Structure formats: structure tokens, C-alpha cells
């Protein structure tokens with residue numbers, strides 16, 4: 001659309017944002033996010049996904065995935081779509097606005113510099129990641145020149161940080177995606 | 190606004206018009222001038238005092254323009270640079286503005302990008318960034334730039350994006366000051 005910023009969502013992602021879901025444990029939240037990653041890969045997207053949850057209830061607010069290529073938008077990273085769709089559902093730019101419960105971002109990989117800033121501005125009070133930055137860059141993706149000690153930057157910003165949650169599974173998905181990135185047809189892929 | 194099958198960021202009349210009107214501005218100040226014009230209309234359209242536009246670096250052909258639409262759009266990622274770069278990619282049918290066969294693109298923005306936009310610029314494919322107001326000018330009216338890397342400018346140049354700042358700074362600050370006063 002030339003009259004607005006329009007990022008369509010693949011069916012699976014639409015399903016994820018339509019069906020009520022509650023996941024109490026961190027492993028439960030991250031496990032669901034990893035399901036979206038495999039499904040995004042199957043839906044022509046990057047091996048990345050994230051979701052916004054109510055930190056104290058585990059209620060899924062919104063889910064997002066990498067749609068850069070099919071979306072014709074380099075700003076379409078998982079964290080950004082998840083944060084935006086969440087803000088659109090709660091009808092506010094601040095997920096920390098008076099009246100709403102604390103929000104948490106559960107992302108399959110540590111945020112690049114762009115999404116890093118996106119998180120700080122989002123209003124979320126917590127960030128939980130799976131794959132470390134080195135894991136993402138090991139298969140080719142660039143995290144960008146994030147400020148030094150970005151983690152300490154978030155905490156000082158009142159944003160608690162956690163990483164490595166279900167890292168092994170997150171890494172397995174990053175590597176299978178990489179094992180198909182090529183152009184030579186692979187029936188196994 | 191809010192949707193189920195998509196993230197839809199509506200645009201106000203003037204911005205829609207700006208994204209569909211033929212406009213070729215060769216000189217740098219010409220481009221920055223138009224952009225500051227968008228700032229004003231945006232302020233009147235309930236948006237923040239920020240705007241940007243992507244241009245064909247050498248011909249000055251306007252490709253797309255964006256403005257801060259955070260509050261009215263209920264989206265903290267809706268900064269001038271994000272939308273402009275995003276709508277430019279939409280109009281050129283690609284996520285990479287440096288794609289082969291595509292002309293070099295430039296993002297003329299009213300204020301220096303925040304840590305977030307900093308990254309968007311890097312992943313956008315643009316090869317040039319021209320800014321009017323400086324970071325301290327932005328911070329001087331209550332707008333945060335977030336924790337950017339040490340020497341974000343060198344960070345952009347190291348990646349093939351030449352940076353120019355201070356262009357029409359004074360004219361842009363007058364718009365920042367007025368926005369702040371109201």
C-alpha cells in the first residue's frame with residue numbers, strides 16, 4: 001500500500017494473534033515463540049519470532065515474526081512486529097501506560113541494534129531472549145553496532161534482561177534454516 | 190489502525206499526498222526544505238515534530254516520506270525514518286534499497302536518528318543520510334535518542350552510508366522550539 005505502512009501477516013501469525021493463550025512459565029512462553037519460528041521459516045520468513053506477554057499472568061498479547069523479505073520491509077523484524085501489533089491491540093504507543101499490566105517481550109534471538117532501540121521505546125519492562133548474539137551472527141545475520149553493554153543499558157532503563165532461555169533449541173532452528181538458505185534445490189528442505 | 194491480518198500504520202492526508210506527488214529536488218537544501226515542510230504539517234496533524242524522506246541521491250527524485258506518528262498511530266516504532274524507509278521499500282518493491290540496478294538512495298531527515306532509527310538506516314539499503322537538527326537539539330525539547338553506539342556517525346560511514354548533518358539546522362530548530370512552546 002502506497003497510502004500507509006502495511007505489513008501483512010501470514011495465516012499462522014494471524015492465528016497466533018487471534019487465539020487466547022496463557023503460558024505461565026518462561027520455558028512455556030519461549031517454547032511457543034520457537035514454534036512460531038519454525039512456522040515462519042515454512043512461511044517464507046526469517047528464522048526469528050517474538051511475542052509480547054503480560055509479565056505477571058502469562059497472557060499472550062501479540063506475536064510477531066521476521067517478514068523482511070516477503071514484506072518488502074527491512075524494518076519488519078520479529079521484535080518490532082510483536083511490539084507494534086501489541087500496541088495496536090492495546091490501543092496505545094506505551095505498553096507501560098497507566099492502566100496496563102507490565103509487558104514482557106519474549107524473543108527467539110537477542111535483539112539487533114534496531115530492535116534494541118525498539119524495545120527501549122516499547123514500554124515493555126522485561127526482555128527474554130533465546131539465542132545469543134554470537135549464535136545469530138554465526139550463521140550470517142548481523143546484529144549491528146549496538147552500544148557497549150547494551151544489556152546493562154536496558155536494566156538501567158528499568159528493563160530486566162534474560163538470555164539463553166531454550167538456547168539449544170533456538171540454535172537448532174537457526175542452523176536448519178541456514179542449511180536451506182541456498183539456491184540449489186534440496187528435497188529434504 | 191488495528192487489524193488482524195496486518196500491521197497497518199495509517200497516514201494523514203498531507204503524507205499520503207507527499208508519497209504520491211511527483212517531486213524532484215536536486216539541491217540538498219531543496220530536499221531538506223521540503224522535509225521541514227512535512228514537519229510543520231505533521232505537527233498540525235497531531236504527530237511529533239519529525240519528518241524524513243528518501244530521495245534518489247543524484248537526481249533528487251522524491252521516493253517516499255515519513256513522519257513521527259507515534260501517538261496518533263499508537264506505535265512507538267512509528268518514527269519519521271522508519272516509515273519513510275519502509276514506504277520507500279514498498280514503492281520500489283524490495284526490502285533492500287541498495288539492490289542491484291536500483292539507483293543510490295538517500296534519507297533526508299529533520300533530526301539525527303535515535304538508536305532505533307540508527308539501525309533501521311543501516312538495514313535499509315540507503316547509501317546517504319542528511320540531517321538537519323542535531324541530537325542535543327532533539328534532547329533539548331524532551332525527545333530521547335536512546336543509547337546509541339560510541340560514534341554512531343562513524344558506524345554508518347563504516348557501512349557505506351555517508352553522513353551529512355547540520356543542513357538547515359537553524360530552520361529545523363525553529364520548528365522544534367515552536368512545537369515545544371505548544
Ligand SMILES: Nc1nc(O)c2[nH]nnc2n1
Nearest residue numbers: 239257268269303332333
Ligand atoms: N528521538 C525521536 N523521537 C521520536 O518520536 C521520533 N520520531 N521521529 N523521529 C524521532 N526521534
Ligand SMILES: [Zn+2]
Nearest residue numbers: 077112114115
Ligand atoms: Zn532486529
Ligand SMILES: [Zn+2]
Nearest residue numbers: 268303305306
Ligand atoms: Zn527514531
